[PDB]
């Protein structure tokens, strides 16, 4: 980002000859993969939907993604992991009960 050179402000610190960081395989730990996504899809049709999954899919078709949503924080935890969960759910509604 290169600082402003001065003490504080928008960028606190000296702006010396910066370099572009070499490859850090680390940050891409959560990679899609055609071997993990191919075998992850077979999971949705071999185990299909779970009891609380079926409970929350229709829970949506109930009062909305505010009823099943505030109930997913209790059936899970992190509000961000809670809505990452409601994401793959509307994915099963269209890609299964439609065509």
């Amino acid at each position: 980002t290169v600082k402003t050179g001065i003490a504080i402000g928008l960028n606190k610190g000296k702006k010396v000859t910066s370099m572009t960081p070499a490859p850090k395989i680390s940050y891409k730990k959560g990679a899609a993969s055609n071997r993990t996504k191919f075998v992850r899809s077979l999971v949705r049709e071999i185990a299909g939907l779970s009891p609380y999954e079926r409970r929350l899919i229709d829970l949506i078709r109930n009062s909305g993604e505010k009823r099943a949503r505030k109930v997913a924080k209790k059936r899970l935890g992190s509000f961000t992991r809670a809505k990452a969960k409601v994401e793959e759910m509307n994915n099963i509604i269209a890609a299964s009960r439609r065509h």
């Binding site: 600082k3 050179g5 001065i6 003490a7 504080i8 606190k12 610190g13 000296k14």
Partner: protein, 148 residues
């Protein structure tokens, strides 16, 4: 060196230094810090006013490293000027021949003031500085260059 100790100087005088009509009784008023908010509150009021209690907002993960304020001033300042050529930039003080000062690569980020200095044009690469402080630096020839 029990030699010059007033122990041998009171040995045999019965009481041995703490009396006999009251004496020293292990922990008379208490042990450690005797009843501050109790009977020893007369020792804190007048001698230690303000110990008990809380003050302002609390700070968490407050390292004195992120709160580093190495302040300096005008009365001296020439202290960071190397002796060898310090005399050269004092009397024969001129412009273009200005003294380069890296106060952070020295350990004095903040530069403030006190008792003036001789009218000399010098570059001072600092971090932070006071308002009335930089005021006097300019009227003599001194300048400021902010680095980190």
């Amino acid at each position: 060196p029990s030699r010059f100790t007033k122990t041998r100087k009171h040995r045999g005088h019965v009481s041995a230094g703490k009396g006999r009509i009251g004496k020293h009784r292990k922990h008379p008023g208490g042990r450690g810090m005797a009843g501050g908010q109790h009977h020893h509150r007369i020792n804190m009021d007048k001698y230690h006013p303000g110990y008990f209690g809380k003050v302002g907002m609390r700070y968490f993960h407050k390292q004195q490293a992120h709160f580093w304020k190495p302040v300096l001033n005008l009365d001296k300042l020439w202290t960071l000027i190397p002796e060898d050529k310090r005399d050269q930039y004092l009397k024969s003080a001129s412009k273009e021949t200005a003294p380069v000062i890296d106060t952070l690569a020295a350990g004095y980020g903040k530069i403030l003031g006190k008792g003036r200095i001789p009218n000399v044009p010098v570059i001072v690469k600092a971090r932070f500085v006071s308002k009335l402080a930089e005021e006097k630096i300019r009227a003599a020839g001194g300048v400021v260059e902010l680095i980190a």
